[PDB]
Symmetry: C5
């Protein structure tokens, strides 16, 4: 009953369209990490490549905090990502809607730290020329906020190495390397824009 | 809690089915601009071509204005497009439903300026005959309000040049030219004129 | 402000599930018209043909009337089709769910007249045999109410000549002719007539 | 006016999650009937076959009754199927989610009689070998409640002969025969018997 | 009347986002078992296989208990899966969103025991090399909670032997053997163990 009471209280006046910072001049810092599971398909007739991965996202939500003492020792809740503010992290060169492969549930801890790890299949622009060689081919796709600038959302990675420890061992494609690198840029605008570049080098097995 | 109170205030009595003008005799002026990203696929057996692009849309919403000073200095809000009035900009010769490639969130400034930029994959009617020649092939598609006449929605482009600076350099198709041009049309259904922006693309295998 | 007040008042006690008539013994008269844009493909291996068109529907909704004078001169509103009653006009021999290619928004005038013009892509049962000859091929599909009798919904066309003036000029298929013909059907099952509009298309490879 | 009041009354305390019977110990009798319109496709590389048909369903809802005199003489209402209790009739050997071709609207008569006739496209497990011969091929698929046992939902047909009077006369396949036959089955999960209607079609090019 | 009354009481303050245990320190034990129906397709150019099956899930919901004597003798209710708490059982190596082939309705008994048996079509990562030989091919996929650890959701099977008694006998592929085996995994992201059931399928061309 404690958890049920916690959730109702937390979400009574909660807004999912407002960046969850105490002061609006503050940035929301989002840590991003990829676990690449499979290169399913590299289509040289359309230059689309298909990846399956999951994408760990972490940030702090100021308004989703509580003292576990007040609620039977409850330290975590599990909430549909749709009901909380989430960062709108988007692939910048997809060619199809990302397909979701996992339940869209975020795990929130009593200190407000959110963990959200959607599994995804992405088709993105990539010319696989060289994939049939020992050296392999390389491709890249950028991920970032669609509507928030670097003053509103800041992106970080914990490491520039993509997690390959769960890559499908019998994929049609061997992974040779995969990095995830933060990049800052300016344009019209006084404000920095941030993305994480996902670079993959791979070859037919 | 400033932004939260702002949003609750703005949307307490807001209706998304009502054109956002102080006076209904007034027209909503919408600026459209296309950013072409990739010609993914051209199908000569059905004469459908698939485009990936961003569509920049800008208009003013009369009822989404506020003074930053009364709300902690908040200057912009980010609202799902489904929750505000939007221009029903529609491709007139699509052959499949448009696929949405970005979050559907509109950015709204304190002066009521809305900016909404959906990325899309569109299949539309297009004969790619000649795409394998120096001259290439030429296709076009009209974008405009499906249900609002020119007395209700009017369109403007900032330039007739389509933005090609984000076009996929390794695309199977090279863009020779791409324009976006405002047009007026009449349809047998309705006595009033309707406005569209005609996207004309000339392209060729690389 | 006025339109918002109008809309609030009209849909306070509105039911999208009841036919919009003063008394239930009255019939709703729906006028249908097709504007055919493209035969995208004709599949010889399954005998399915894919059409892109938009379908003008008009009828009067008794409970959607107002005096513009009481509402700042507002002459019409734009309401999502899902929120008003609509005629459940359905193809009787489709092979896939219809794909929606336009916003689902109805236009309602102050005298209650509703205009709703969905753009659609439809696969239906059709044998393309002879499409590669000069005589061409002929196919047909009936449109009508799924759950309402002829005493509840009646169908009319303004003309039996389909609007072909917007047909895609570089389609893989030329349209030889297209008619939209009201048919009245009597089944032993029912005393009441059943009414459909028969879309007949003669076509061939360009 | 009258109808709007009838509908508000009927559904004030109605629940679409509760079998519509006065006595819980009573069974809901559902009459089931198929109208086969077309065999669209027969895929010999995956042994899937695609049917288009109308599925006629009929039952009584005890709580959707009224006297026409008390409501301006309205004798029928037309309600989204999702808003009333419906039998969860399911194909047991489909290989894709069934596609709905018609409006999901049920017609309820004042005596509580419900008529619901979804048109569907179904891909189901079927080996079309011999479809190119005079003998043709024969496939079958069961239809029944997914979660209600024979003690809760019973199925019946009015005839064992599938209705072929609407069959597409220029289909790639002609129907040699098509029957619909009530069956009782037991499944490993549950001790109660379950009811289905077996659709058997023999066809050829 | 009784059942309606019971359902209203059960769900007045029910939360589907809260694990249905009395004490939050308690684990929810979920029994899983697969019934394989068909290997539809095995794609050697992408190494994906398409499997049709249904998946029996059983657990106890602490808050969905009642005395049948208090409610006309009602012993079972039938509730859409989406309206109760359910374990988020997920295939860990799927390559397409899973397709649901059955109504999503859970059966709940008066002692709170829930039975939920979704039928599904799954594409998952699978190298069919050898499927055209007598030894056939072997693939595996793990099923488990996505967001709940072994301290919150545990899994059990009744048997390691997968139910093959309903397998389609005219499938393009035959199943030589199939096992379902409980396992415990550890991830770097999270300090707690996670439970899965590993489905292993050996199969070949018929
Ligand atoms: C009001 C309405 O639906 C329309 C008005 C004219 C413009 C195009 C063609 C038909 C449709 N969209
Ligand atoms: C309760 C339930 O979902 C079921 C009960 C038995 C009938 C068929 C097979 C498994 C499933 N549907
Ligand atoms: C919390 C969450 O979403 C997850 C937790 C660990 C178990 C697996 C791997 C990552 C993801 N699912």
């Amino acid at each position: 009953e404690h958890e049920t009471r916690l959730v109702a209280k937390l979400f009574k006046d909660y807004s999912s369209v407002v960046r969850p910072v105490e002061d609006h001049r503050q940035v929301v810092e989002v840590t991003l990490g990829f676990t690449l599971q499979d290169i399913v398909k590299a289509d040289s007739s359309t230059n689309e490549v298909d990846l399956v991965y999951y994408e760990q996202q972490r940030w702090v939500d100021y308004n989703l905090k509580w003292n576990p003492d007040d609620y039977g020792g409850v330290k975590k809740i599990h909430i549909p990502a749709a009901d909380i503010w989430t960062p709108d992290i988007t692939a910048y060169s997809s060619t199809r809607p990302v397909q979701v492969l996992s339940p869209q549930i975020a795990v929130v801890t009593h200190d407000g730290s959110v963990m959200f790890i959607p599994a995804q299949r992405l088709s993105f622009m990539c010319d696989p020329t060289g994939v049939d060689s020992e050296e392999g081919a390389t491709c890249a796709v950028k991920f970032g906020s669609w509507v928030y600038s670097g003053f509103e959302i800041d992106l970080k990675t914990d490491t520039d190495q993509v997690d390959l420890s769960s890559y499908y061992a019998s994929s049609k494609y061997e992974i040779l390397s995969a990095t995830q690198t933060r990049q800052v840029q300016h344009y019209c605008c006084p404000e920095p824009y941030i993305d994480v570049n996902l670079v993959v080098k791979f070859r037919e097995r």
